[PDB]
Design a protein around this ligand. Sequence first.
Ligand SMILES: NCCOB(c1ccccc1)c1ccccc1
Ligand SMILES: NCCOB(c1ccccc1)c1ccccc1
Lengths: 95, 491, 166
Amino acid sequence: CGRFFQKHQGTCFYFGELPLSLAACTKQWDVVTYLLENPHQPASLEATDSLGNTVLHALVMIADNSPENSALVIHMYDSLLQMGARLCPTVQLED
Amino acid sequence: CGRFFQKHQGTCFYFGELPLSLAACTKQWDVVTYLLENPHQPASLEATDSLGNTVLHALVMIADNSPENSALVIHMYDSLLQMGARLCPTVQLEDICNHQGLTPLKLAAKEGKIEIFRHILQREFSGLYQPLSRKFTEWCYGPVRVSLYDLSSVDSWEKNSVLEIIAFHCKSPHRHRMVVLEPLNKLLQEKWDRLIPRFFFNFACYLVYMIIFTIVAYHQPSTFGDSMLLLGHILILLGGIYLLLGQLWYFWRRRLFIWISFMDSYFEILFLVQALLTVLSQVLRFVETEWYLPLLVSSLVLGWLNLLYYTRGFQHTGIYSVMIQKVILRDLLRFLLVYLVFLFGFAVALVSLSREARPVPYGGILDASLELFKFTIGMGELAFQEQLRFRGVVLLLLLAYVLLTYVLLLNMLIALMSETVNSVATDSWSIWKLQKAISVLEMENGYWWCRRKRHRAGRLLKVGTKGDGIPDERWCFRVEEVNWAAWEKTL
Amino acid sequence: QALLTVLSQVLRFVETEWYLPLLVSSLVLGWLNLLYYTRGFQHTGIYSVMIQKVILRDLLRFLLVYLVFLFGFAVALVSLSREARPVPYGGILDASLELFKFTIGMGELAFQEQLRFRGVVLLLLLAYVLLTYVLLLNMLIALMSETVNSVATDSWSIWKLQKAIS
Ligand SMILES: NCCOB(c1ccccc1)c1ccccc1
Ligand SMILES: NCCOB(c1ccccc1)c1ccccc1
């Protein structure tokens, strides 16, 4: 939670300032997997950022109407939702 | 150096009249290599032709906007630059002023070559030959790109620049499309944003001057009031002389411009005319001449019309002004020519008739012309004059005039301006951006009296290390852009 | 419209002569407001949306340029026609109204013989007509053709959004 990562005008890139949200917004299919299924300390998926956004919120935030950006956002959104269902079904991430 | 090879009109082909330049312009990949690396007598690469062009200059000159020609020129330009770096790195080929004092980039800008111009304007290579790059990328943290476009030979700080060449020295038909390329469109936008305060200050000063001029003209001769009138009059004279000097200095400092594009500016002409009419009006008043008032009032009208020079500091209204200009210059002068031919013919016809009976209508040519124009503006008197002996002929002649002029030509003029407004929609935007570019470039240098201090845009950012010891520096235009198509390929 | 109506009534209670302009403005504005309702229909709602786009896109620019022209030429004609050899162009309001008359097809384009700058006044009027009636009005028709063509699908979508809001 600094100044470059926080959403503002100028030099910036918003990704939720979470390592898992960074991996998701940066198309790291494997990093997110390791963070989620590392035995030493599994990485939570419901974790919110200082602004209140979750990985899904942030992954929407970077979404832009570019066809390639839209494809990336859709793919990672669906895949991360599926993973969230697989790991901890008891909690509904969409809400 | 003969006649066929020299650039002229007719049977010709310019290639720099050097064997190496000939090989380069003729896609001789191998001959150039042998000339450069023949052990017996290596061929120099910096060699200039009688005109001052080098091989790179020549590759620019033959450049045309054909996709195949552009591809050929780009490929040979890049490859030859790489070879020049490989053979003799110590000498920088991109910076070789020919006899006209133009580098290959400036030469491409002046000669209208757009594809080679944009390519040179934004190019990058791999680690090797990296210094021979104009666009860079410092870091790509995330999907953002910090593009650093080289501003060498393109910023306005230098005496002669690509921006100035495009604005004033280029005579290409559509040079307005080179000021929308990435570096130029962003740098020019930043400069415009920085200059909005001065653009509005110039607008406000001119508007105040025109308000004073209107007030003075409204209250003139046909104590305190006399004193205020006098100070306003002298203020108007001083303002008129100021605008006259400004326009005269715009022309003298830029005396090599009218011949390129007379109608590109076409407000410095109008501003000059308005200022001239103002000062001439004042001097004739000193002479106590009755021809004062027409000149002062013409100055008033023309100044109020000139305000629409300023009305185009806005996207919304500047494109409207550009498109008014296109309408006038495209499908209003033709209409006026045809309409005036019709009107003169029918006016002299009606005057010839209506001269024999059985307050005379159509008394002379002026009256008949004015009645016909009245038809044009929606108040033509179309009656059956019973007094003149050719009632029917005059009526039929008027009806024919109405059909040919009001029903046909005016409505067709509406149709033609619909067509022209539709035609010039994107070009209007580009031309407006060029107008902003010209205004910015004029605002950068101060007024004709104030020697403005330059402000050199860009950052002196150390980029890479040259093929030497102690490193180098270079001024670049730092640009942020969010990209995902490129980002998916950097993994 | 509602504010003007209530304010009109209270001023009537005050017995003020500025009642009638306010009440009549409320009347005009309410009758114009009825076009809010006229867009419960596909046929007419898109028309209303596209009227709005025309006004906001290529009517305010025309008004700005036209009023600059008109003020310049009106003060010019008033400055002239003030020295001879019911005075036309007596003041700024009269000259402006005559020029607008030109705009609406009712412009008196005569050769005033009484004033000493007959030719200058006539040429100035002819230039005003060429710049305004022949160029700017017909060009406004062309611009509104261009805007009507531009906003055809967007008009449908905007009308559907208007229905959604209602
Ligand atoms: N808005 C018109 C201002 O003056 B325009 C005009 C005035 C006098 C002579 C001819 C035309 C002119 C300049 C701008 C665009 C095109 C024509
Ligand atoms: N159809 C015009 C009705 O009133 B319009 C109008 C009335 C008063 C002031 C300005 C314009 C208006 C409302 C709808 C669309 C845009 C303008």
